[PDB]
Amino acid sequence: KPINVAIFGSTGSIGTNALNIIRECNKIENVFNVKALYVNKSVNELYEQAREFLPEYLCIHDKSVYEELKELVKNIKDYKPIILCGDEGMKEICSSNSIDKIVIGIDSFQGLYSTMYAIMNNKIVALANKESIVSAGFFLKKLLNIHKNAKIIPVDSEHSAIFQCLDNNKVLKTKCLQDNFSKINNINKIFLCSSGGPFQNLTMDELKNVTSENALKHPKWKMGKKITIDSATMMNKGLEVIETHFLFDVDYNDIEVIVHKECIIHSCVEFIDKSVISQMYYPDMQIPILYSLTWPDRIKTNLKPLDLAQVSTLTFHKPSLEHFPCIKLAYQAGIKGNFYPTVLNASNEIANNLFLNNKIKYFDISSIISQVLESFNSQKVSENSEDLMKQILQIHSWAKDKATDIYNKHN
Amino acid sequence: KPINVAIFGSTGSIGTNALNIIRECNKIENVFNVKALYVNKSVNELYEQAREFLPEYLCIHDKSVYEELKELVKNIKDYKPIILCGDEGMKEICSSNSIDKIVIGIDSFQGLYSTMYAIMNNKIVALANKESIVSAGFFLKKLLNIHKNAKIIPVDSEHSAIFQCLDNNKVLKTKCLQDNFSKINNINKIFLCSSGGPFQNLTMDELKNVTSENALKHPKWKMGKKITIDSATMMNKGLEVIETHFLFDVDYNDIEVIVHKECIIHSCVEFIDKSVISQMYYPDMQIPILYSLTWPDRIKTNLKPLDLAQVSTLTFHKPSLEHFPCIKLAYQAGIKGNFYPTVLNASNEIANNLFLNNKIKYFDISSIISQVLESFNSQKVSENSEDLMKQILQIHSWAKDKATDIYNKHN
């Protein structure tokens, strides 16, 4: 009964942690068949992975390196894969009857596209890309009601933790992103844990002058610059608030951000009786990824057991909204609903990059996002799925342009 | 539609907490029907409960206050309960078709008798009385394999926590005490949390001098004297290690006692992937009691929500077995199996009472228990239930007598 898995974004942080835990688990017993690997342009790395996992399908997005990949894969003896390119190749892979589960480790806005096609092919979608949910949550809800056999299984660590705290006898009566998920699971409230990022103990005046260099300074987890910046501003956590609302149908007044600097308790679920269940481990994306691929079961690993006595102390505190104004903006956009989350995500893409490139200061990030949100006006939501997607693209693009206009006007 | 419940030991700590949470849950809808109340001799307090809850059945164990009870209840107009006494009364209630679930909040080895009869009648037994499981675990396993519709649902707080941490999709395919429970639930290891008791930070020289007055000075939970003294010696945790083994089919080497002095995390389960799930709340037996009666569902309470940021800090350390030798004894008895747990429990009943009454010192408790364990010789386990029960009572009585003899000899 092998688990037939595609890795989308196989050469990045999520995709490499995915293949790492697949490789480790397979040494204990052969449970995973890596059926497909897909990247943008890392042709050499993709060759290396093909050599180890020998998947039925290989796909690279950039046409320019397609021929190169074909050439490299000739070196592999007794190995005749289907080698594909672009959106076309992504669609072929998602339509393959032999693939059951697709890890979406593709970053940014691009991630939404393969997520959509994985859903349209009624797959299990192990979704790490939170921006897809924040930008397109209602659309994805509509799409999951057309494609009844598709499921999104959360991989973002906090959302994986929440999901792991549930009773699957209740989860199996519903699915993530469905209205009423929280009611069917008897969920009352969520505690959404955060590392707090590097700036958690800075004063307002220190924040005024922090730089992206300071933000990119060996945090509790090593990741790409974009999510690292978001962790520093706590807009990551704001996006994760919206992600929680969409995935689990929890009201915004019932999502509490809590700063947990040790990063052992990964989030907690308060049920209607007031009992609280939490998921814990060392910080490591292997467990969230693995659970997304084994759910509703678990399998043996050789990971180091948690030593709670050694950890010794766990601490919890409320984040300061004045120091981390991005969090308030995310709640405000979420509560407004409509396409406000799309606008939040898009404007933050721009503001994050401005700050990364030393073009704006820390409080300018929230200033720009706030000004874009204030310029948007709620749009009638199309009932037509294709039209709705068009609206999300139009609004995303508008909001990025607006954020850049605001920066250029001031500058 | 209402859950039909009996409360055994209705006037004590567990029973009163059970009626408190039932009263709250019954404010608007008829969620529970309190069908029966049973006590030992608290006739006046039973009468008062009867006036409120008007159960079909009343039972009092001590037949010397049966007449007092009949006389008091006549004062309640238009109420015609079945009024019973002793063992016969207990058995009639257990055999009633009108009763689905029984809360066992009777203390000491005496609680085993009603536990056995409730199982024999295929009831759901919400079991707080841990001494029953320690004294008679293997026998209760045998009885639960006969009486296929009976279940034990744990009420002891740590064991309720463990049970809540599990995935009900898996729990529903087995039941507590059943062989292979841990395999079916993908359990690797248990972190069994403890308050540590009042003596947790004493030096060895300080601990030599402790008295029961010191042990009974206002702990983190107000409870009666026996469990309060067991908390102080950590024999309560020792008993709970054995209870964990039997309820969840977890090997002794996979049960780790952790002292968690804030008493917010109530225990944790490590699964085979090394993910850990924990259950948390303020100390309050209403959640474990309610859960036992609603499982596999949860219902709404009006308990104060957990304020994790206010709690702020959680700590964990390993207990010192030199300071708390009772823990070691319990592991030793458990690992030996046979009737060694019966002897542990019985000898502890004596030693606890001697210390309570200022007859022996703290380290004498563990000395006495150790000596009785070293005295006992393994017996062939009776193959039939009636004989097995007689053997348990014989061995329990022998071990109490042995502990008393050791005490009599030493002074």
Ligand SMILES: NC(=O)C1=CN([C@@H]2O[C@H](COP(=O)(O)OP(=O)(O)OC[C@H]3O[C@@H](n4cnc5c(N)ncnc54)[C@H](OP(=O)(O)O)[C@@H]3O)[C@@H](O)[C@H]2O)C=CC1
């Ligand atoms: N890293 C982490 O621990 C966490 C990340 N996340 C989320 O996970 C997502 C993925 O992040 P991460 O692994 O950090 O990202 P990376 O930038 O490390 O990896 C992105 C991957 O996607 C590939 N890719 C990019 N565009 C395309 C495309 N058009 N078609 C196919 N493949 C594509 C890249 O290929 P190439 O190598 O060719 O560039 C790379 O393999 C993000 O949305 C992030 O928010 C969530 C929680 C934590």
Ligand SMILES: NC(=O)C1=CN([C@@H]2O[C@H](COP(=O)(O)OP(=O)(O)OC[C@H]3O[C@@H](n4cnc5c(N)ncnc54)[C@H](OP(=O)(O)O)[C@@H]3O)[C@@H](O)[C@H]2O)C=CC1
């Ligand atoms: N209190 C707590 O928070 C916790 C308790 N436990 C366990 O729960 C059990 C009960 O503890 P707790 O409620 O503290 O004890 P209590 O001493 O407060 O209450 C005992 C109850 O049992 C009744 N009882 C005693 N003997 C008999 C009998 N022969 N027939 C019928 N009823 C009888 C008493 O009746 P009467 O009033 O007439 O004396 C009373 O109603 C113990 O095994 C303990 O280990 C487990 C976890 C925590």
Ligand SMILES: O=C(CC[C@@H](c1ccccc1)P(=O)(O)O)N(O)CCCc1ccccc1
């Ligand atoms: O979204 C992220 C990255 C950012 C957040 C974070 C949280 C915990 C540690 C470091 C960083 P934030 O700072 O926004 O709270 N993540 O899910 C953590 C991935 C690493 C991980 C951590 C715990 C459990 C398993 C995997």
Ligand SMILES: O=C(CC[C@@H](c1ccccc1)P(=O)(O)O)N(O)CCCc1ccccc1
């Ligand atoms: O067995 C007991 C009593 C003794 C142990 C304890 C644990 C937590 C606080 C104080 C005392 P020990 O000292 O042996 O760890 N109990 O289950 C707690 C009952 C009260 C309670 C606590 C947490 C959750 C719900 C109810």
Ligand SMILES: [Ca+2]
């Ligand atoms: Ca009398």
Ligand SMILES: [Ca+2]
């Ligand atoms: Ca559960």
Ligand SMILES: [Ca+2]
């Ligand atoms: Ca083991």
Ligand SMILES: [Mn+2]
């Ligand atoms: Mn996250």
Ligand SMILES: [Mn+2]
């Ligand atoms: Mn307990």
